[PDB]
Design a binder for this molecule. Sequence first.
Ligand SMILES: Cc1cc(CN2CCC[C@H](c3cc(C(F)F)nc4ncnn34)C2)cc(Cl)n1
Ligand SMILES: Cc1cc(CN2CCC[C@H](c3cc(C(F)F)nc4ncnn34)C2)cc(Cl)n1
Ligand SMILES: [Mg+2]
Ligand SMILES: [Mg+2]
Ligand SMILES: [Zn+2]
Ligand SMILES: [Zn+2]
Lengths: 327, 339
Amino acid sequence: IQPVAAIDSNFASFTYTPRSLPEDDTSMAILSMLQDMNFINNYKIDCPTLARFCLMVKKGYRDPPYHNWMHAFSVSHFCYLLYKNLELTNYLEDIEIFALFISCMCHDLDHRGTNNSFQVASKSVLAALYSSEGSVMERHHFAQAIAILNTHGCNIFDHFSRKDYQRMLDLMRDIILATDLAHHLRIFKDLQKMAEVGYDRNNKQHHRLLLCLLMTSCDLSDQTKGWKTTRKIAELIYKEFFSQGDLEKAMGNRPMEMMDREKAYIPELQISFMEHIAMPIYKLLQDLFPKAAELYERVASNREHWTKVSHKFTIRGLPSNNSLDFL
Amino acid sequence: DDEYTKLLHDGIQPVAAIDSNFASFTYTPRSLPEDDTSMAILSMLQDMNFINNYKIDCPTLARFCLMVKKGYRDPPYHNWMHAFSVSHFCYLLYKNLELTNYLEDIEIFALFISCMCHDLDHRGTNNSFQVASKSVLAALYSSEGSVMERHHFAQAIAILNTHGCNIFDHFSRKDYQRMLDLMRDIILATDLAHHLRIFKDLQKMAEVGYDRNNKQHHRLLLCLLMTSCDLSDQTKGWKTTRKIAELIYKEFFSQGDLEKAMGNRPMEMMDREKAYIPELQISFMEHIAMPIYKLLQDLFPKAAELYERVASNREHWTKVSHKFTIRGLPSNNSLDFLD
Ligand SMILES: Cc1cc(CN2CCC[C@H](c3cc(C(F)F)nc4ncnn34)C2)cc(Cl)n1
Ligand SMILES: Cc1cc(CN2CCC[C@H](c3cc(C(F)F)nc4ncnn34)C2)cc(Cl)n1
Ligand SMILES: [Mg+2]
Ligand SMILES: [Mg+2]
Ligand SMILES: [Zn+2]
Ligand SMILES: [Zn+2]
C-alpha cells in the first residue's frame, strides 16, 4: 500500500543501504517497490495473494550469517534501483523486469549456508536430486519458489495468460540458475561480445544475457555501497564460509583455502574477489549503461580500501593487553 | 627498619637454600620473589667469599643492599629485578667459568657490585631521550656522552657516600681508588654504544689469546662480562625471553609515545604503530646478542650453552612470526578493529 517516498527520501538512490531498513518493514517495502514499478496494476496482481506470497518467500529463508532474507531483500531492492536509475523499461520488456524482481526475492530460498560442492561432498538429498544437472542449490531455490507459488493463496500468476504464466516460469528458472557464479563465469565472454557489438533491444538472445548480468549485479550489490557495508558483509560471508570449512574438516576433507579459518587471509581473498569477479561485472554494467558508472567506482574504491586496511591484519606493537600470551 | 633488622640478625642463608638449581645457567632468577632478593645478594656475596675476604661490615652491607634496591624505580624492564637478575648472572659466571684464572679478586667483586648498581634510578627512557627532552641528566652529562650510565655511576657513588653505607670504607687508599675506577669502567661499559666501539678489540683479544698479564685484556674482558650479564635474560628459555620482550617493548613504546607528543619521530622499535616485534628481536639477536655470546664462548669453552640458547631463542622468533598475522576472523568474529 505505502508510497516509496514515505519509507525514506533516499530510497531510490544508489547511495541508500537497504540493510538499514528494519526487517519487520521489509515485506511492506517489497509491495511498495512493486507498486512503484506499477506491476500490480499492469498485470492485475491480487494484493492479498501478493501479500501472502511475499510473507511465504521471507519465511522460506533460513538464518545463516549471509544467505538469509535480508540478503534476498537487499538483492531485490537493488533490482528496483536499476529500474529507477537506469530506466530498464527502455532495454527490457516489462515481463522480463518483473520476472527479474521476483527472481531476486526467491533466488536463495532455503539456503543452508553451504556452497554446491559441500552438498555433493556430503551426499545431501539435494545433491542426490540435482548434482547430475549442476548448480545444486540454485535448482533447489527454484524448486522452493515453485512450491511457494503452488501453495494455496500464494500463486501471484493465477490469472495470467498461458503465454505470460509460462514466460514467467521460464524467466525465473533461467534467472535463478544464472545466480550460480559458475554460470556467470561461463557466459562472461558472451557478455563482453554483447557489450562490444552493442545492446540490440530487438535481439532475444541479448535480452537473455542482460538478464543474467543484471541478476549477478543484484546478487553482488552489497559491494556497491560504502566501506561500512563491505566490512560487515565480509564479516558475514567469512563466518558462513568458515563454518562450512569446519564441517568439511570433521568429514576428513581439506576445505578450499577461503573456508579454512586457520589458513584464510581475508584481505587477499577479498581483494581477489573484488578485482577478479565483482569489478568486471560492474565494468560490463558501466559499458552498457553510462549511468552505472558510480557503481563500478564504488566497487573499485571498496577494493582499494581493503589494500589500505590490509596492514591491520598484522600485529604491530603489542596487543591491547600488553601481553604476547596469544603465543 | 624491620627489613634491615632481619638481614642483619637472622643470619645469611646458604645459597643452596634459595633453589636446588640456583648456581646453574638453566635457573631463572626472575622466579625468586622480590622480597627474598636482598638476602640472596648476601648469600651470593658470602658464597663468593667477598664478605670475609674484604672484611665487609655486615650492618653496612645490609644497609648498602637495601639502599641499592631502593634506588631502582619501577619501569617495566629497568627495575630492581633486572639489576638482581644481572647480578645473579655474574654469580653464575663466577661459579661456572673459573673467572679466577682470568681476573683479580677485586675485579670480580667490582663486577658484581657494578651489576647491582648499573641501572640505578633508570626512568625507563634511553640516552637519546634525555638529550631530546633536555633533561637534568643531559644538562649534567651530555657533553661527555653515555648520559644514563654516568647517572647510574653517580648514584652508586652517592650511596657509598651515604653515612653507614660505605662497604669499602676500610679499604686502603689504593684499593678504594681501584674499586671506584673499576665501577666507573664497568658501569660505563653497559652503554651498548661503548660495546660496539670496542667490539673489534674484543675480537682481536679472542683471536690472539687472552693474556692475564695484559692490563688491557683485563679491561676488555670486564666489559664483555658486564655486557654478558646485562643481556643474560636472552640465555634462558623461550618463556623467559617472551616475557622479557613484553617488558622491553612496553618500556620502549611508552618512550615513543612521549617522543610523538613532543613532535619527534621515534625509532621504529619505540613506535607501537610501526614496530614488528618478531623482526626486531631477530635483528637484536643477530646483530647484538649472538656475537656477544659467541665471543664469550670463544674465550670460555664452558660458555657454549649460553650461545646455543641465544641462537635457539633467535630461531623461536622465526618459528612464531606467522602467528602475528591474523588468519580467518578474530575470536570475537568481528572486523570492528579495521575502523
Ligand atoms: C573466488 C571467490 C568466490 C566466492 C563466491 N561467493 C559465493 C557466496 C557469496 C560470496 C560473496 C558475496 C558478496 C556480496 F555481498 F557482494 N560479497 C562477497 N565478498 C566475498 N564473497 N562475497 C561470493 C567468494 C570468494 Cl571470497 N572468492
Ligand atoms: C638493535 C637493537 C638494540 C636495542 C638496545 N636495547 C637497549 C636496552 C635493553 C635492550 C634489550 C635487553 C634485553 C636483555 F634481556 F638481554 N633484551 C632485549 N630485547 C630487545 N631489547 N632488549 C637492548 C634494542 C633493540 Cl629491540 N634492538
Ligand atoms: Mg545463491
Ligand atoms: Mg643500562
Ligand atoms: Zn544470493
Ligand atoms: Zn641493564
